[PDB]
Amino acid sequence: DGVGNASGDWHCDSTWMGDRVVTKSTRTWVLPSYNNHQYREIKSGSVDGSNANAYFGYSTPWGYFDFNRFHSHWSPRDWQRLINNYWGFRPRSLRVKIFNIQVKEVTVQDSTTTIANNLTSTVQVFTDDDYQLPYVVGNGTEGCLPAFPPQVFTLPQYGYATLNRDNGDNPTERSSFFCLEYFPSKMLRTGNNFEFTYSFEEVPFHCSFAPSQNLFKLANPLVDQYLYRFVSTSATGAIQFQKNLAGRYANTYKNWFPGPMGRTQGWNTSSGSSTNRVSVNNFSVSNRMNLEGASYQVNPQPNGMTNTLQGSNRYALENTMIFNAQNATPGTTSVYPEDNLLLTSESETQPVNRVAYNTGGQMATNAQNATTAPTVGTYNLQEVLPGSVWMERDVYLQGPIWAKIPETGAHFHPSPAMGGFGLKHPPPMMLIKNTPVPGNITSFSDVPVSSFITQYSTGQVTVEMEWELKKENSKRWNPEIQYTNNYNDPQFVDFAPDGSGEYRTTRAIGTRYLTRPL
Amino acid sequence: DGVGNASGDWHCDSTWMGDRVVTKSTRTWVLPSYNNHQYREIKSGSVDGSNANAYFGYSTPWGYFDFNRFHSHWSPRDWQRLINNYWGFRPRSLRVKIFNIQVKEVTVQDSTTTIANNLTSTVQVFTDDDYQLPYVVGNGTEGCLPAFPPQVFTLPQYGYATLNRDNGDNPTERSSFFCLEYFPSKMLRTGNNFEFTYSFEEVPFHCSFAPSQNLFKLANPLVDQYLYRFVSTSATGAIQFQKNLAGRYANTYKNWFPGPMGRTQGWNTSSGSSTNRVSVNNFSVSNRMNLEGASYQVNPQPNGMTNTLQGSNRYALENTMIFNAQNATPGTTSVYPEDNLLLTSESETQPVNRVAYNTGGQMATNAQNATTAPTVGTYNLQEVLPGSVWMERDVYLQGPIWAKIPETGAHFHPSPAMGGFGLKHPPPMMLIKNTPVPGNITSFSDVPVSSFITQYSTGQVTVEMEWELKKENSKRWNPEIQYTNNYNDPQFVDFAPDGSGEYRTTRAIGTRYLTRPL
Amino acid sequence: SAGESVQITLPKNEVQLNAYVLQEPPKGETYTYDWQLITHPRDYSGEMEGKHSQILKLSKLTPGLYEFKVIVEGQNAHGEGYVNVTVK
Amino acid sequence: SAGESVQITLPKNEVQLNAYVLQEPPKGETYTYDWQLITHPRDYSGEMEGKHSQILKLSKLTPGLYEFKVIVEGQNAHGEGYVNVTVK
């Protein structure tokens, strides 16, 4: 529209209206000119002695907007209002708007770097509505809209891995190259803006409640069962039985079973670090799955287990989501102690989910005879069974919202391991790049020009999300557990900027506070 | 319209809808100020000892848009979809749009070259709708829209040759000077755009199929002909005959004949380079035609021949289209081996077209008597004959689309030798130039000002083409040959950018894969 | 750049860190050091005294990892060092 | 500019190329060489090690023509050389 007219306003807000809540976030972004306007074939061989690290892909000159983290939409107080009062929620719609674009020309001379705006430069933007591009958004990576509204952020560079040959850095006949310029995109000069809208598919509500009953103790503790159980064999081999008494939950017949489990090693946090094995390199003794001839770690394991047992300091670390308390630099290889990190605990699900670091149980391992005694053996892993129930991983304020279900034609219970909503058609990738501007070209050449004017753009982005809420409807008499701002002798305010302006966050806030009977 | 408003979007796409396909390409161009806004008389005498190299012409300050190459419109995958599934295609319409123009002012001081935009500068654009200018677009020259969408390209400078005297660098009384400013053109400042539309004349479909029958073996191999042939003369001179038997194709009467041929030398590619004559300079022993007192090479010869014989490594190089695997610099005189180039093979047409490096046949060369024996002599060249059939040259992904038929009032079978569609009224030349901006002129002078501010412009160009397709309609039972992405132990992806960002292409992709009986 | 790492334990925590740079300039030319705490324990409150000096003083250091980045620049000569501090 | 051309045959292919420029500067002034492969066989995959150095190392060289363009510049003195490599 115009150089001296704003193409949009600043909208950050939450509006609660019954069973709906609309969140609005606006952030300032900055887009670098990645790769110098070129596509590059990126590849890697075996790194750290693991050929599962090998890949073949492409880095593109495009950047992308990632809105896949709860804190990009929810302030800590609104999150508290959500988890203390509702049984569940789910995304309904999304509206994105990119505006107030500013393209800057950078010029370095002799020890001098000036910056001036280029009023005629454009920025290109498109959304991948048909999912024709490798969707890299739901894999727990950096670059999402920052939690704290005033924080300015750089858009991450779009890249992808395709097929590599024999766990090496070579491509195969099936490796695919995708050209992002081969999509129709809108071009924006300083007065133009871009708007996009999207609606989520019917997805089940995330469960924001913990069970107030144990799965194996659902029977009335005052009445016996009209069922009998084999208890022994007489001195002559006659089978003997007894009635299952009231309250003896170790013996009652069960109708339902706990979800699938796969044993993972348990480690003690600090209080119990003296009981941990010393100097052990976890990779060699970790849970791994094989695929195409290589072994990959599979944290945080499939859903169905609890990583800790409420009241203990032992964690099944590979079944745990681990966040940094602060934003880290790219490529850091420092070894962090637990004092800098935020460990998540899924102990609220222990009345239903089995403990990840213990054996799942025991089964018969032979045929009993008058000469051979009955034998049992414990099992470390057990997959899904008919009539089994479990609770999915909880969502966190600083964790992912959705994940795209891989299109293969066959899947089971499409719920991403890192938590969130599994979607067949998630919010489309929104790509953006600075349109190239050639330097001073005087003569002709059939070779593509390589000399460009260095630029970078900036602007604002606003994301509006409507969420549907599930009202709590309990008849519990006594008070419930609530997430509360409880600190003893605070030296600073959590979820607030400190003296240096840095946003501080000392806790990973889950969703499970309210209870429900089974 | 405005400085801060984009005058167009980015459209790159292909849309298949039945018997039609619409291709859209957008590229970024850069236009240098050629000649410093002046027209120059360019001329040359005899170069490399050949006066066919002499010419007299004009270089203009204009540049031009060339869209005459298939890869400027077709991605490699769309081309594969085209050649594996259709029997033919042809251009129907064209729409061109030039937008987002940016004029840059260049200023060099003391060891410093700054670049700033000039918001008031214009660019001039016009199309030669009536074909009043020398059409230089369909002669296999550089400067077309690049194959890979993200590649920025420089527009080539418009120039032409007119008549020269006695194969020298002097003009004749008939030499014509054409002033491009003597045409009405649109002037564009940064907010303006230019659009042009055009429709192709009814042209025959290009044939994207190879014959699955040989021209001389069209007769049923199970039935004899009711025709007899002269086989000999008795010991007393009586002529003798025999019936033409079933399957003896060397003797059957024919109804049709192969197209015209003109013998060209054959050379062996690498596998057979030890059988090639050594150290031979091809110019002296090449196929040449004379015109106006000078001899010119006439590659790739007229249509009607096959340059190779499927199953051999010998090529009739002068009857072959040879492309570079990559874009080359202007004026390079390096001697390339076949390892850097892409040789095209027309062997699919061998069941119908005669082999370019063999003799065409033999005919009687005397009058037989009781004293003189019948004599025959082979012929190296043979032009068109009634009842002859042949296949035109195939089109390539990296080759020309059309050629303008020279207006002389008399021509035969207007099909360009380099392949493509022969047009009487092809897409008009689209010329563009940077409008001159005088430097600081203080006093008056009747002499045209020579001091100008140095500028260059850039923008985007989008070309939309509609193609008409001819559906394949075969009853062949067994599978057909298809173009396929087949490489053994690939070190990189063909038709993809490599590690340095360079677009790689290791193969010239033709059009002949499907078969048809004659 | 360098990467010096230090370590401390027990209750004591207050510590000071100096800054060493190669190609030392003349007395007439002094650099303006600058320290940035890029990593620290989630519990860290502490204070940084003398950031623009050669010695950065740290107090109230709780157990964990601390990452500093001292940048030493002058007349046509930019530089910077890295230091890791681990408290048990 | 110059135009040195080299040639090699047999299976061996890995080769290194140096850079020579006239008007050599003092020890205190070193140039920042830059090599660009402007021409190579359509089959070439290879790698270029030490582009910004005086010696550019080449490996996995398949038969064909290779055109390089080494540009040597310094304080008020731009230059460049050309080299052709032919593998049989």
- Write out A477-511 in H/E/C secondary structure: CCCCCCCCCCCCCCCCCCCEECCCCCEECCCCCCC
Distance between C27 CA and the closest CA of chain A, angstroms: 25
- Deposited experimental method: cryo-EM
* Residue in A closest to B11 by C-alpha: A184
Q: How far apart are the first and last CA of chain C?
A: 26
The closest alpha carbon to B509, from B79, B196, B24, B65, belongs to: B79
Show the tokens assigned to B303. 């249509």
- Token pair of A101, please? 């674009």
**Buried-state track A255-273, b at ≥16 Cβ within 10 A, e below 16:** eebbbbbbbbbbbeeeeee
List b or e across C1-19, with b for residues whose CB sees 16 or more CB atoms inside 10 angstroms.
eeeeeeeeeeeebeeebeb
Count of C-beta atoms within a 10 Å radius of residue B83: 23
Which of B106, B149, B501 is opposite residue A38, by nearest beta carbon?
B501
Cα B495–chain centre separation: 21
Tell me which residue of B286, B268, B219 sits closest to B248, measured CA to CA.
B219
The verdict on a CB contact (< 8 Å) between A342 and C42 is yes
Burial class (CB in 10 A: 0-12, 13-18, 19+), A32: middle
In angstroms, the CA C61 to CA C12 distance is: 8
Q: Which residue has 């008849």 as its token pair? A: A475
Question: What values do phi and psi take at B360, rounded to 5?
Answer: -75, -25
> In angstroms, rounded to a whole number, what is the distance separating the alpha carbons of residues B179 and A296?
70
Residue of B nearest to A4 (CA): B4
**Nearest neighbour of B336 by CB, restricted to D43, D62, D65:** D65
Of the candidates A328, A337, A342, the beta carbon closest to that of C64 is on A337
Cβ contacts of residue B358 below 8 Å, gap of 6+?
A: B263, B266
Mutate: best of C6, C9, C39, partner A, most A CBs <10 A = C39
Interface test with B, best of A39, A186, A450 (most B CBs within 10 A): A39
Q: What is the resolution of this structure in A?
A: 2.4
Residue A223 burial (CB count, 10 A): 10
Q: Among A185, A192, A442, whose Cβ lies nearest the Cβ of B32?
A: A442
Which residues of chain A make contact with B485, given a CB cutoff of 8 A? 173
- Nearest of D5, D52, D6 to residue D33 by alpha carbon: D52
Contact predicate A326/A346, CB 8 Å: no
Rounded CA-CA distance C88/D88 in Å is 65
DSSP secondary structure, B125-142, as one string = EEE-TT--S---SSSS-S
Residues of C with CB under 8 A from a CB of A: 37-43, 45, 62-65, 67, 76, 84, 86
β-sheet bridge partners, residue C5: C84
* C45-65 core/surface letters (b: 16 or more CB in 10 A; e: else): bbeeeeeeebebebeebbbbb
In chain B, what residues touch A171 (CB-CB under 8 Å)? 490, 492-493
Structure tokens, D60: 């996995």
Residue with token string 């503790």: A221
Query: Which chain D residue shows the shortest CA-CA distance from B490?
Result: D45
d(CA B246, CA B251): 10
Q: Which residue of A has its CA nearest to C61?
A: A339
Touching chains, C (3+ CB pairs < 8 A) = A
As a whole number of angstroms, the distance between CA D79 and CA D81 comes to 7
Which residue in B513, B411, B468 sits closest to B204, CA to CA? B468
Measured distance between the N- and C-terminal CA atoms of chain D, rounded to whole angstroms: 26
The count of C-alpha atoms lying within 13 angstroms of the C-alpha of B493, restricted to the half-sphere facing its C-beta, is 29
Q: Do C65 and A334 touch (CB under 8 A)?
A: yes
Measured between alpha carbons, how far is residue A271 from residues A133, A278, A313, A338 in Å?
47, 15, 7, 11
Which residue, B87, B140, B137, is CA-closest to B321?
Answer: B140
Q: DSSP letter string over B406-443? A: P-SS--SS---TTSSEEESSPSPPEEEEEPP-B----S
Distance CA B87, CA B210 (A): 9
Report the first-to-last Cα separation within chain A, whole angstroms.
58
B-side interface with D, Cβ within 8 Å?
Answer: 111, 325-326, 328-329, 334-337, 339-342, 491-492, 500, 504-506
Angle (nearest 5°) at CA B284 between B278 and B290: 155
Distance CA B313, CA B270 (A): 8
- CA-CA distances (angstroms) from residue A176 to A57, A170, B95? 9, 13, 31
Residues 6+ apart with CB under 8 A from B91: B200, B203, B401, B402, B421, B465, B466, B467, B468
Neighbouring residues of D32: CB distance < 8 A, sequence distance ≥ 6? D52, D73, D74
CA angle B21, B22, B27 (to 5 degrees): 140
Q: From CA B70, how far away is CA B88, in angstroms rounded?
A: 14
CA neighbor of A200 nearest in space, from A105, A277, A351, A91: A91
Binary contact (A442, B115; C-beta < 8 A): no
Q: Are strands B354-355 and B305-306 parallel, antiparallel or unpaired?
A: parallel
Nearest Cβ partner for C41 among A335, A339, A505: A339
The residues, any chain, with a CB within 8 Å of residue B255's CB and separated by 6 or more, are B218, B387
